[PDB]
Amino acid sequence: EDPWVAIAKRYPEGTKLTGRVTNLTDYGCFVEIEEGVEGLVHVSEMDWTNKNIHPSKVVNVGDVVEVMVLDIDEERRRISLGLKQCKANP
Amino acid sequence: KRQKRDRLERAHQRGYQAGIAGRSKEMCPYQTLNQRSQWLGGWREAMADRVVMA
Amino acid sequence: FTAEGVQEIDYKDIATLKNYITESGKIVPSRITGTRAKYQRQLARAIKRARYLSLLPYTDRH
Amino acid sequence: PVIKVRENEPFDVALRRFKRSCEKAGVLAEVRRREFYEKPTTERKRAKASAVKRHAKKLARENARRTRLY
Amino acid sequence: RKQVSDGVAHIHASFNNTIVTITDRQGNALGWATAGGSGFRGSRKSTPFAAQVAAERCADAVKEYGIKNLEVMVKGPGPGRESTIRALNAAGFRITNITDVTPIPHXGCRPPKKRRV
Amino acid sequence: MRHYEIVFMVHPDQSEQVPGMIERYTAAITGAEGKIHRLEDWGRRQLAYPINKLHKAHYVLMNVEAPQEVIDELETTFRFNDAVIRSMVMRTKHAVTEASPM
RNA sequence: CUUGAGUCUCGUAGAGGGGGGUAGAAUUCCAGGUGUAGCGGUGAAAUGCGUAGAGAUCUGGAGGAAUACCGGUGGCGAAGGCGGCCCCCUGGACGAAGACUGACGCUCAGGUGCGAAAGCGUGGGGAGCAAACAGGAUUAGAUACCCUGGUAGUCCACGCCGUAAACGAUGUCGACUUGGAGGUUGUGCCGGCGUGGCUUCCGGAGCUAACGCGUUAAGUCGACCGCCUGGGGAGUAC
Ligand SMILES: [Mg+2]
Ligand SMILES: [Mg+2]
Ligand SMILES: [Mg+2]
Ligand SMILES: [Mg+2]
Ligand SMILES: [Mg+2]
Ligand SMILES: [Mg+2]
Ligand SMILES: [Mg+2]
Ligand SMILES: [Mg+2]
Ligand SMILES: [Mg+2]
Ligand SMILES: [Mg+2]
Ligand SMILES: [Mg+2]
Ligand SMILES: [Mg+2]
Ligand SMILES: [Mg+2]
Ligand SMILES: [Mg+2]
Ligand SMILES: [Mg+2]
Ligand SMILES: [Mg+2]
Ligand SMILES: [Mg+2]
Ligand SMILES: [Mg+2]
Ligand SMILES: [Mg+2]
Ligand SMILES: [Mg+2]
Ligand SMILES: [Mg+2]
Ligand SMILES: [Mg+2]
């Protein structure tokens, strides 16, 4: 009810977190510490081998990971996290 | 003729082709998560290209 | 939810209604915003009333 | 889907914003849809198919975890 | 002749063709090209490549005038719905602004019947 | 008799005439043993979209409790008066008094 | 006599019906400005539109029809059906405590009324769409599918017609008989625990030729009605 309205808090694309994953998909993972709030980070990201990476492979459930916010969709209510960025730039 | 082609590459191109032809993800014939990743990987790349085709 | 014990969502509450539309003025579906059934129906009537009075838009292309 | 370009923003960051602008406004879907008139019976019969599918997409996420391969 | 500086580029991306026209910011046409005029016919006419040519060969139809700014304004679902926005970049304009103006009825009139084949 | 709620907007250039209009209407209302429960006045606001190529309008909220014929006269009055560029007449279940979010 | 049936009191939700207003998007047209050689269409083409300046783009005006998003295996109606917003008239359902009537009930041949779309009559209206019709293609042929146009009609008023795979292919009313997950709408007592209505999916016993149905029964019974009796000939002839 409350949290989505004042989502300025971590709005800036540059902002980064450490959140904890809930479950995996095969297109992402979802990393949800913010509580009542949850990102995704798509399988495109998480690696520098594009999709040559199953989410299960790089990360597993109940596992904390550093991530930047990239895109918040105020309405439609969906945040786009990035995991390949908060670690190396080879 | 003497040796089977790369299974991962084939799986990635089968994915692409179901993609362009517009089948649903969840037609994917693989449960081997390794091949599965290739299949969907193709299928999603293909979803982009359909748009700019007629 | 608009379930701070509200009787009848109001159209002139422009501050609130803006949270339930998008950039292009389209009403956002209940499943996205977690709105209950009968608060969504009020939310619809209000935004429609508003649009008449020009307190809110129909589009961006105008 | 009206993106203004930001200070020093690369063109190939505006463009991808613009694409994602109308992906989330679902334009081509709307246009694709209204190319031709669908009889109101056909539209409504589509709506059932969507429902009887969505439903069975709240079944695999249960039942698979019960069964087992090899 | 009378230089401008600030323009706008309308793009009409149909399934069969792509018309592109630069105009002053009161919408007065200055130049234009198509895929049909670019030298493509039928199968070819309806591609993102043929649309690209159009955009850049429309860019060197408006050299006469000033240049720098250009707000793009795209309409329709054709394949020419980006290859142009790309081409205008390497044509050497700066795109300040860019927007879909594809018309949608809020109901409107009955569409044609569906094609049996 | 029965509650309403008017919310008439009026041509900007002719805002000077609005205090008169409010004066007049609230006469007719109560001149049939009616009432006024609210009467805010929002004043030259910005229109979300144009109206006859205007980009502003002077808004005037107003509640009532009247019988039908006067609230009817009032609507016709708005029709022909051409400084009044939009109207609106909802019914409401009760009297409404508390000041508006505007 | 009060348990069936009904009346009153306070509220709730709703595209239920009738009448009258009005608002934004869009298409087509008409009148201007800019501008110049193509537009349109298809699997590929052509008919068609365009130097008498189209298409594209901007401004002004006219007119009709339908109401994006909300929107959901959501809601309302006896069924057919019902979707922008606002007032006027109007029907039904549901719940909470109370009071009131006292079997006033259920079903119903004949009868009476409502009844999608097309169609018909009179008078309007006509944007878009589109039977007929005309031209272009395809094909051995193509009175088709596909393309370009396009008249009835589709819209409004009043009056007819009485039909549909008018379907849950399942008549109406009442009683009884293990469960599970939802949706929508009331109301109790403490965001947990109850108690009503309507509804979606799944399944047990039972039933079924099987498919399946399964407390919204196609299970177990009672009341009344409708209907069937090999296929063609025929829902046709008189
Ligand atoms: Mg067509
Ligand atoms: Mg105009
Ligand atoms: Mg007695
Ligand atoms: Mg009878
Ligand atoms: Mg009869
Ligand atoms: Mg008819
Ligand atoms: Mg005839
Ligand atoms: Mg007639
Ligand atoms: Mg006539
Ligand atoms: Mg036509
Ligand atoms: Mg035709
Ligand atoms: Mg012919
Ligand atoms: Mg009528
Ligand atoms: Mg009639
Ligand atoms: Mg019959
Ligand atoms: Mg029958
Ligand atoms: Mg029964
Ligand atoms: Mg069952
Ligand atoms: Mg039975
Ligand atoms: Mg049987
Ligand atoms: Mg027979
Ligand atoms: Mg006969």
mmCIF file of N, CA, C and O in Angstrom, chain C residues 24-61:
data_model
loop_
_atom_site.group_PDB
_atom_site.id
_atom_site.type_symbol
_atom_site.label_atom_id
_atom_site.label_comp_id
_atom_site.label_asym_id
_atom_site.label_seq_id
_atom_site.Cartn_x
_atom_site.Cartn_y
_atom_site.Cartn_z
ATOM 1 N N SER C 24 0.204 7.925 -20.226
ATOM 2 C CA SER C 24 -0.772 8.171 -21.278
ATOM 3 C C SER C 24 -2.206 8.076 -20.742
ATOM 4 O O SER C 24 -3.122 7.729 -21.494
ATOM 5 N N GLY C 25 -2.402 8.363 -19.446
ATOM 6 C CA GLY C 25 -3.727 8.640 -18.908
ATOM 7 C C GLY C 25 -4.612 7.398 -18.787
ATOM 8 O O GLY C 25 -5.745 7.497 -18.320
ATOM 9 N N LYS C 26 -4.097 6.234 -19.196
ATOM 10 C CA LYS C 26 -4.865 5.001 -19.138
ATOM 11 C C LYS C 26 -4.922 4.503 -17.695
ATOM 12 O O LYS C 26 -3.921 4.535 -16.984
ATOM 13 N N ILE C 27 -6.101 4.021 -17.285
ATOM 14 C CA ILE C 27 -6.317 3.525 -15.935
ATOM 15 C C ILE C 27 -5.513 2.237 -15.777
ATOM 16 O O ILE C 27 -5.439 1.445 -16.713
ATOM 17 N N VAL C 28 -4.912 2.035 -14.595
ATOM 18 C CA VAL C 28 -4.012 0.913 -14.371
ATOM 19 C C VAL C 28 -4.825 -0.245 -13.792
ATOM 20 O O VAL C 28 -5.619 -0.033 -12.872
ATOM 21 N N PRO C 29 -4.672 -1.497 -14.291
ATOM 22 C CA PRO C 29 -5.542 -2.591 -13.866
ATOM 23 C C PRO C 29 -5.353 -3.004 -12.407
ATOM 24 O O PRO C 29 -4.258 -2.881 -11.858
ATOM 25 N N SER C 30 -6.437 -3.511 -11.805
ATOM 26 C CA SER C 30 -6.495 -3.855 -10.392
ATOM 27 C C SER C 30 -5.330 -4.746 -9.972
ATOM 28 O O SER C 30 -4.826 -4.614 -8.859
ATOM 29 N N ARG C 31 -4.949 -5.687 -10.845
ATOM 30 C CA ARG C 31 -3.968 -6.704 -10.500
ATOM 31 C C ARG C 31 -2.607 -6.056 -10.258
ATOM 32 O O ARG C 31 -1.826 -6.552 -9.448
ATOM 33 N N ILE C 32 -2.332 -4.949 -10.958
ATOM 34 C CA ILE C 32 -1.076 -4.233 -10.802
ATOM 35 C C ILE C 32 -1.075 -3.505 -9.460
ATOM 36 O O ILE C 32 -0.082 -3.555 -8.737
ATOM 37 N N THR C 33 -2.189 -2.839 -9.131
ATOM 38 C CA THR C 33 -2.202 -1.867 -8.048
ATOM 39 C C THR C 33 -2.746 -2.488 -6.762
ATOM 40 O O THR C 33 -2.800 -1.807 -5.733
ATOM 41 N N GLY C 34 -3.158 -3.760 -6.816
ATOM 42 C CA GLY C 34 -3.634 -4.450 -5.628
ATOM 43 C C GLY C 34 -4.975 -3.915 -5.121
ATOM 44 O O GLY C 34 -5.363 -4.210 -3.991
ATOM 45 N N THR C 35 -5.696 -3.162 -5.960
ATOM 46 C CA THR C 35 -6.964 -2.580 -5.550
ATOM 47 C C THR C 35 -8.011 -3.686 -5.441
ATOM 48 O O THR C 35 -8.000 -4.645 -6.216
ATOM 49 N N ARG C 36 -8.917 -3.542 -4.469
ATOM 50 C CA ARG C 36 -10.012 -4.480 -4.300
ATOM 51 C C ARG C 36 -11.052 -4.235 -5.394
ATOM 52 O O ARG C 36 -11.027 -3.192 -6.049
ATOM 53 N N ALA C 37 -11.962 -5.206 -5.588
ATOM 54 C CA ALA C 37 -12.926 -5.130 -6.682
ATOM 55 C C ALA C 37 -13.646 -3.779 -6.670
ATOM 56 O O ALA C 37 -13.484 -2.987 -7.601
ATOM 57 N N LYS C 38 -14.415 -3.507 -5.605
ATOM 58 C CA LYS C 38 -15.384 -2.420 -5.645
ATOM 59 C C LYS C 38 -14.697 -1.068 -5.443
ATOM 60 O O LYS C 38 -15.349 -0.035 -5.600
ATOM 61 N N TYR C 39 -13.397 -1.052 -5.110
ATOM 62 C CA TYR C 39 -12.680 0.218 -5.060
ATOM 63 C C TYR C 39 -12.168 0.557 -6.464
ATOM 64 O O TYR C 39 -12.025 1.758 -6.790
ATOM 65 N N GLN C 40 -11.940 -0.478 -7.295
ATOM 66 C CA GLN C 40 -11.504 -0.278 -8.672
ATOM 67 C C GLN C 40 -12.636 0.354 -9.478
ATOM 68 O O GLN C 40 -12.381 1.212 -10.320
ATOM 69 N N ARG C 41 -13.878 -0.065 -9.206
ATOM 70 C CA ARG C 41 -15.034 0.440 -9.934
ATOM 71 C C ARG C 41 -15.260 1.913 -9.599
ATOM 72 O O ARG C 41 -15.552 2.700 -10.505
ATOM 73 N N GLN C 42 -15.138 2.279 -8.312
ATOM 74 C CA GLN C 42 -15.172 3.680 -7.909
ATOM 75 C C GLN C 42 -14.010 4.441 -8.552
ATOM 76 O O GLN C 42 -14.195 5.561 -9.034
ATOM 77 N N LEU C 43 -12.815 3.826 -8.540
ATOM 78 C CA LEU C 43 -11.634 4.461 -9.098
ATOM 79 C C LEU C 43 -11.876 4.758 -10.579
ATOM 80 O O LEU C 43 -11.388 5.766 -11.089
ATOM 81 N N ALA C 44 -12.648 3.905 -11.264
ATOM 82 C CA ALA C 44 -12.936 4.119 -12.678
ATOM 83 C C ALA C 44 -13.876 5.310 -12.865
ATOM 84 O O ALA C 44 -13.595 6.188 -13.678
ATOM 85 N N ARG C 45 -14.984 5.338 -12.116
ATOM 86 C CA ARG C 45 -15.980 6.389 -12.269
ATOM 87 C C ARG C 45 -15.333 7.747 -12.018
ATOM 88 O O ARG C 45 -15.604 8.703 -12.739
ATOM 89 N N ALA C 46 -14.469 7.813 -10.995
ATOM 90 C CA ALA C 46 -13.833 9.055 -10.581
ATOM 91 C C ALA C 46 -12.954 9.604 -11.704
ATOM 92 O O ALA C 46 -13.109 10.756 -12.106
ATOM 93 N N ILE C 47 -12.045 8.762 -12.209
ATOM 94 C CA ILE C 47 -11.132 9.163 -13.269
ATOM 95 C C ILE C 47 -11.927 9.577 -14.511
ATOM 96 O O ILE C 47 -11.497 10.473 -15.238
ATOM 97 N N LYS C 48 -13.085 8.941 -14.749
ATOM 98 C CA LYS C 48 -13.916 9.288 -15.894
ATOM 99 C C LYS C 48 -14.574 10.646 -15.658
ATOM 100 O O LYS C 48 -14.542 11.494 -16.554
ATOM 101 N N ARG C 49 -15.153 10.860 -14.465
ATOM 102 C CA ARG C 49 -15.683 12.172 -14.121
ATOM 103 C C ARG C 49 -14.580 13.211 -14.315
ATOM 104 O O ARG C 49 -14.750 14.145 -15.093
ATOM 105 N N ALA C 50 -13.444 13.024 -13.626
ATOM 106 C CA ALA C 50 -12.323 13.951 -13.702
ATOM 107 C C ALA C 50 -12.069 14.371 -15.148
ATOM 108 O O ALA C 50 -12.067 15.563 -15.446
ATOM 109 N N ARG C 51 -11.879 13.381 -16.036
ATOM 110 C CA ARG C 51 -11.532 13.615 -17.434
ATOM 111 C C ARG C 51 -12.511 14.596 -18.084
ATOM 112 O O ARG C 51 -12.092 15.481 -18.830
ATOM 113 N N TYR C 52 -13.809 14.439 -17.802
ATOM 114 C CA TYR C 52 -14.805 15.378 -18.292
ATOM 115 C C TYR C 52 -14.369 16.806 -17.954
ATOM 116 O O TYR C 52 -14.217 17.634 -18.856
ATOM 117 N N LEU C 53 -14.113 17.064 -16.660
ATOM 118 C CA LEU C 53 -13.854 18.408 -16.148
ATOM 119 C C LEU C 53 -12.456 18.910 -16.527
ATOM 120 O O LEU C 53 -12.151 20.079 -16.314
ATOM 121 N N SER C 54 -11.609 18.028 -17.070
ATOM 122 C CA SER C 54 -10.293 18.396 -17.578
ATOM 123 C C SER C 54 -9.326 18.594 -16.411
ATOM 124 O O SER C 54 -8.339 19.324 -16.534
ATOM 125 N N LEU C 55 -9.604 17.907 -15.294
ATOM 126 C CA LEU C 55 -8.697 17.876 -14.158
ATOM 127 C C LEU C 55 -7.633 16.812 -14.422
ATOM 128 O O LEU C 55 -6.575 16.822 -13.796
ATOM 129 N N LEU C 56 -7.946 15.888 -15.343
ATOM 130 C CA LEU C 56 -7.028 14.855 -15.793
ATOM 131 C C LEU C 56 -7.167 14.685 -17.303
ATOM 132 O O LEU C 56 -8.229 14.982 -17.851
ATOM 133 N N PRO C 57 -6.130 14.192 -18.025
ATOM 134 C CA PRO C 57 -6.220 14.014 -19.472
ATOM 135 C C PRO C 57 -6.887 12.707 -19.901
ATOM 136 O O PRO C 57 -7.164 11.843 -19.072
ATOM 137 N N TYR C 58 -7.143 12.581 -21.210
ATOM 138 C CA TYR C 58 -7.491 11.305 -21.818
ATOM 139 C C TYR C 58 -6.242 10.644 -22.403
ATOM 140 O O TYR C 58 -6.180 9.418 -22.469
ATOM 141 N N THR C 59 -5.266 11.457 -22.844
ATOM 142 C CA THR C 59 -4.134 10.984 -23.632
ATOM 143 C C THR C 59 -2.893 11.814 -23.300
ATOM 144 O O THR C 59 -2.889 12.579 -22.332
ATOM 145 N N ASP C 60 -1.835 11.646 -24.108
ATOM 146 C CA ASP C 60 -0.739 12.605 -24.174
ATOM 147 C C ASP C 60 -0.832 13.408 -25.472
ATOM 148 O O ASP C 60 -0.469 14.587 -25.504
ATOM 149 N N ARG C 61 -1.319 12.755 -26.539
ATOM 150 C CA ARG C 61 -1.434 13.375 -27.851
ATOM 151 C C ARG C 61 -2.683 14.263 -27.908
ATOM 152 O O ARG C 61 -3.596 13.991 -28.693
#
